[PDB]
């Protein structure tokens, strides 16, 4: 579990969105496993606007924050899971590291702010959905 709170927006994994997130939907993309909903209170997170390939992510299944090198956002084949059939997931970055399904929502951050959230994993890899291209998260 986990979310990014920036301005009046809440960014969550699309598969973990609640009834309130869908009722207050701003934007969602099944191919990215992302959903953004509106909030009444202002958030304090800052989204990174950079091309960083090193950062730290939180892994709840180990209660640990791991420093990682990650690939640039790409279209990657992702095996079938409890929430999606086998498909290509877009804007996805991979790192070598631990992840389990319940780790989705864990933040990946670099020196510039939030880069993305855990979305995939398996075989000693962890994948993160990028949010740095969603420039509109910074305004209105
Ligand atoms: C096998 S370890 C692992 C870690 C994180 C996630 C998964 C599987 N998965 C991937 C889904 C997607 N984004 O396509 C989102 C929901 C989900 O449970 C496995
Ligand atoms: Zn950065």
14 and 60 co-located in one domain:
no
74's tokens: 């790409």
Measured from the alpha carbon of residue 60, the closest ligand is 1
Same domain, 111 and 60: yes
Q: Please indicate if the annotation marks 65 as binding a ligand.
A: no
Same domain, yes or no: 113 and 132: yes
Same domain, 39 and 68: no
Q: Are residues 49 and 38 in the same domain?
A: no
Q: Are both 8 and 54 inside the same structural domain?
A: no
Catalytic annotation present for 19? no
16 backbone dihedrals φ, ψ, rounded to 5°: -105, 5
> What's the burial of 132, exposed, middle or buried (CB within 10 Å: 0-12/13-18/19+)?
buried
- How many angstroms separate the alpha carbon of residue 126 from the centre of ligand 1? 9
Experimental determination technique: X-ray
Residues with CB under 6 A from ligand 1: 15, 33, 78, 81-84, 89, 99-101, 103-104, 119-122
Q: Of 21, 33, 103, 130, which one is the catalytic site residue?
A: 33
**Catalytic, out of 21, 59, 91, 104:** 104
What range defines the domain where residue 26 resides? Answer: 3-44
Q: Are residues 90 and 101 in the same domain?
A: yes
Beta-carbon count within 10 A of 44 CB: 8
C-alpha closest to that of 118 among 129, 110, 109: 129
Considering the domain architecture, whether residues 60 and 116 belong to the same structural domain is answered as yes
Residue 16 vs residues 3, 6, 12, 44, 89: alpha-carbon distances, Å: 10, 18, 7, 21, 16
In the block, tokens 């993160």 appear at 128
Q: What are the structure tokens assigned to 97, written together? A: 């590291």
* Residues 64, 133 within the same domain: yes
Q: Which of 81, 94, 123 should be mutated for ligand 1, with most atoms under 8 A from CB?
A: 81
**Shared-domain flag, residues 68 and 119:** yes
Burial call 46-80: b when 16+ CB within 10 Å, e when fewer: ebbeeebeebebbbbeeeeebebebeebeeeebee
Q: Within this chain, do residues 9 and 39 fall inside the same structural domain, yes or no?
A: yes
Contact between 132 and 50 (Cβ < 8 Å)? yes
Inter-residue contact 108 to 116 (CB < 8 Å): yes
Cα–Cα distance for residue pair 60/98, rounded to 1 Å: 10
Check if 44 is active-site.
no
End-to-end C-alpha distance for the chain, whole angstroms: 26
Number of domains into which the chain is organized: 2
SS3 per residue for the chain: CCCEEEEEEEEEEHHHCCHHHHHCEEEEECCCCEEEEEEEEEEECCECCCCCCEEEEEECCCCEEEEEECCCCEEEEECCCCCCCCEEEEEEEEEECCCCHHHCCCEEEECCEEEEEEEEEECCEEEEEECCCCHHHHCC
Are 79 and 86 within 8 A, CB to CB? yes
Q: How many CA atoms lie within 13 A of 97 on its CB side?
A: 30
């Amino acid at each position: 579990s986990g979310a990014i709170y920036v301005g009046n927006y809440r960014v969550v994994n699309r598969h973990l969105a609640t009834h309130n997130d869908w009722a207050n939907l701003v934007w969602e993309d099944s191919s990215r496993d992302l959903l953004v909903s509106s909030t009444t209170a202002q958030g304090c997170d800052t989204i990174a606007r950079c091309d960083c390939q090193t950062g730290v992510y939180y892994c709840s299944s180990r209660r640990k924050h791991y420093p990682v090198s990650f690939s640039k956002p790409s279209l990657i084949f992702v095996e079938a899971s409890e929430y999606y059939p086998a498909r290509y997931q877009s804007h996805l970055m991979l790192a070598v590291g631990h992840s389990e399904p319940g780790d989705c929502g864990g933040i990946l951050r670099c020196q510039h702010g939030v880069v993305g959230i855990v979305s995939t994993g398996g075989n000693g890899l962890v994948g993160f959905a990028d949010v740095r291209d969603l420039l509109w998260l910074d305004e209105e």
